[PDB]
């Protein structure tokens, strides 16, 4: 199954304030009006990194697993939100299909009515996470319009990622190396964007 991304999946590309200005940047972005795979799950490719989102009113989706194998042979990311705090660890983990709810190691870290949206990417051994939250009316598809995702985590863990899966209404899209033009308002929030490759007017 699929739905249209519309203008979703843009994020703050760098740690820099800019205001009342338009900045052109090339990065791994979810392309505008691309098709986003819909789920209600199996192991998925990671490709050039992932946009992930879920329409929610219940908090059933608790986490993710990432790696090459996602199992035993090499260090693999486990990421969990348990409502006490966010957990991250990178062990050579072993489990069943997943440690999902029935309702060696080298690093560790701690920190429908709504959409939760996220981006996961990996450049130069920095694994990165971004997010945003908003209220919504539509349950069937990602909401139209725009609001940029902002960074949560930025880890020099140096792992190679080619596969991932979710830990238990949810959506997956792939980032691609594309030029975007980003509009920063007077307060230095991104308020609009252009995918330059979308159409001749966007070029």
């Amino acid at each position: 199954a699929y739905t249209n991304s519309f203008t979703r999946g843009v994020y703050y590309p760098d740690k820099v304030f800019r205001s009342s200005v338009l900045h052109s940047t090339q990065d791994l972005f979810l392309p505008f009006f691309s098709n986003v795979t819909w789920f209600h799950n199996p192991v998925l490719p990671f490709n050039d990194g992932v946009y992930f989102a879920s329409t929610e009113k219940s908090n059933i989706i608790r986490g993710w697993i990432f790696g090459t194998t996602l199992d035993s042979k090499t260090q693999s990311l486990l990421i969990v939100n348990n409502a006490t705090n966010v957990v991250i660890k990178v062990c050579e983990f072993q489990f069943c299909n997943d440690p999902f709810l029935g309702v060696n190691c080298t690093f560790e870290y701690v920190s429908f009515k709504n959409l939760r949206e996220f981006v996961f990417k990996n450049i130069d051994g920095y694994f990165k996470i971004y997010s945003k939250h908003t209220p919504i009316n539509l349950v069937r598809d990602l909401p139209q319009g725009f609001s940029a995702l902002e960074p949560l985590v930025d880890l020099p863990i140096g792992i190679n990622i080619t596969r991932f899966q979710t830990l238990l209404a949810y959506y997956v899209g792939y980032l691609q190396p594309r030029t975007f033009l980003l509009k920063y308002n007077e307060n230095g929030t991104i308020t609009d964007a252009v995918d330059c490759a979308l159409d001749p007017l966007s070029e």
Binding site: K15, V16, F17, E150, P151, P156, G188, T189
Partner: protein
């Protein structure tokens, strides 16, 4: 000015002899509050350690390191390095802080030091001269062993496992007795982030989280989002930063700079000069603030005259009489109420024939440059290299030949408008 013009005589004018540039008064460094130091108490201050002939290492990462304290620590009676010194290590960072710790007889521990020799450095606790760091050891006969000897210790990869349980005794001196020791080698494991006080409103050199430059740091009304660290102007230029120890936003202004122009009458007329610091404020440098910059060594005057030497922003300077350089708002000419009314006319009753000279340039000095002789000076070895650049020398000769023929045409079009050489009567 004489040196700027490469001349001992200077004609009347204004000359940019130099550039004024306010120097950084001091250097700032700011980094975040020091945190996540590697827990080396588990190496040096713990109640036990492994036997040194059977030891193994582990790596610290995502951390600071206590190396700045370790470079002057009392925790060892002796120390040595295969890498750089600990004072350099406290100023550096590495992929991980690889380290190990153990109990041994003191001389057997020395026989496993980085770049040392013996069955320890050979196999029981390996220690090649390629080890990317330092090690330390001290006597421990009261705690590293029993009253019966070094049974809690051992003797004989880097800092890891000819070995056996140690032969040391608690009655011995620090070489023969039981001892405690550790060794390490070298991004994610770094020395501490030493940081200065903050200095607003002075021109300063600065470091903020590895951004560097010279500027006047100023308190500001900008509202960075909680994840943003730097601010940038339209053309990439950094124009604000967040202070990493107290998260307010500092607007960065460049340290004041500008052309220094020397205003002079001719050296015939005087050796006295005035200096304009273009766009500079007089607080940053007689003294007079013009809109063009701070002007020094000229008198501000309330009269107005024709513009002699142009300063800019309506100001001109001149040399006047007992003598000095003055500076004044230039006169655009005398004002005149034309005596207009709906029935008044003025009619000239006489004339002057005025022979106004006008002078126009018409031709340059016709030049041709033999680009092979200019570039290569009659060297064959050079001329063969100039062929690799292809058409450029031919294209430059063609361009200068076009200019040269054009000077003859310019001269022909002006003067040769007459078909016949007319002659004047006797």
């Amino acid at each position: 000015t004489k040196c700027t013009l490469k001349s001992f005589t200077v004609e009347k004018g204004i000359y940019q002899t130099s550039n004024f540039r306010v120097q950084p008064t001091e250097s700032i460094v700011r980094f975040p509050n020091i945190t996540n130091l590697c827990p080396f108490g588990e190496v040096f201050n713990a109640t036990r350690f492994a036997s040194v002939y059977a030891w193994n290492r582990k790596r610290i990462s995502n951390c600071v390191a206590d190396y700045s304290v370790l470079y002057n620590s009392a925790s060892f009676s002796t120390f040595k390095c295969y890498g750089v010194s600990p004072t350099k290590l406290n100023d550096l960072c590495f992929t991980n802080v690889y380290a190990d710790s153990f109990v041994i007889r003191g001389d057997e521990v020395r026989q496993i030091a980085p770049g040392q020799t013996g069955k320890i450095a050979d196999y029981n606790y390996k220690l090649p001269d390629d080890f990317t760091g330092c090690v330390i050891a001290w006597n421990s006969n009261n705690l590293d062993s029993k009253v019966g000897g070094n049974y809690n210790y051992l003797y004989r990869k880097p800092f890891e496992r000819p070995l056996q349980s140690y032969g040391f005794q608690p009655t011995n001196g620090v070489g023969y007795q039981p001892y405690r020791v550790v060794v390490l080698s070298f991004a994610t494991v770094c020395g501490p982030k030493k940081s200065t006080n903050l200095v607003k409103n002075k021109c300063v050199n600065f470091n903020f989280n590895g951004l560097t430059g010279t500027g006047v740091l100023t308190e500001s009304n900008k509202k960075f989002l909680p994840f943003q660290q730097f601010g940038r102007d339209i053309a990439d230029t950094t124009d604000a930063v967040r202070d990493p120890q107290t998260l307010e936003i500092l607007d960065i202004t460049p340290c004041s700079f500008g052309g220094v122009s020397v205003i002079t009458p001719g050296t015939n007329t005087s050796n006295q000069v005035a200096v304009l610091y273009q766009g500079v404020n007089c607080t940053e440098v007689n003294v007079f603030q013009t809109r063009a910059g701070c002007l020094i060594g000229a008198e501000h005057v309330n009269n107005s005259y024709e513009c002699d030497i142009p300063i800019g922003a309506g100001i001109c300077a001149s040399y006047q009489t007992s003598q000095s350089i003055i500076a004044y708002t230039m006169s655009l000419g005398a004002e005149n109420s034309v005596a207009y009314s709906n029935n008044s006319i003025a009619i000239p009753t006489n004339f002057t024939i005025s022979v106004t000279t006008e002078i126009l340039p018409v031709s340059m000095t016709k030049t041709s440059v033999d680009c092979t002789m200019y570039i290569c000076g009659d060297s064959t070895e050079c001329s063969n290299l100039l062929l690799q650049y292809g058409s450029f020398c031919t294209q430059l000769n063609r361009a200068l030949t076009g200019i040269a023929v054009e000077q003859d045409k310019n001269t022909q079009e002006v003067f040769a408008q007459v078909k016949q050489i007319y002659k004047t009567p006797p």
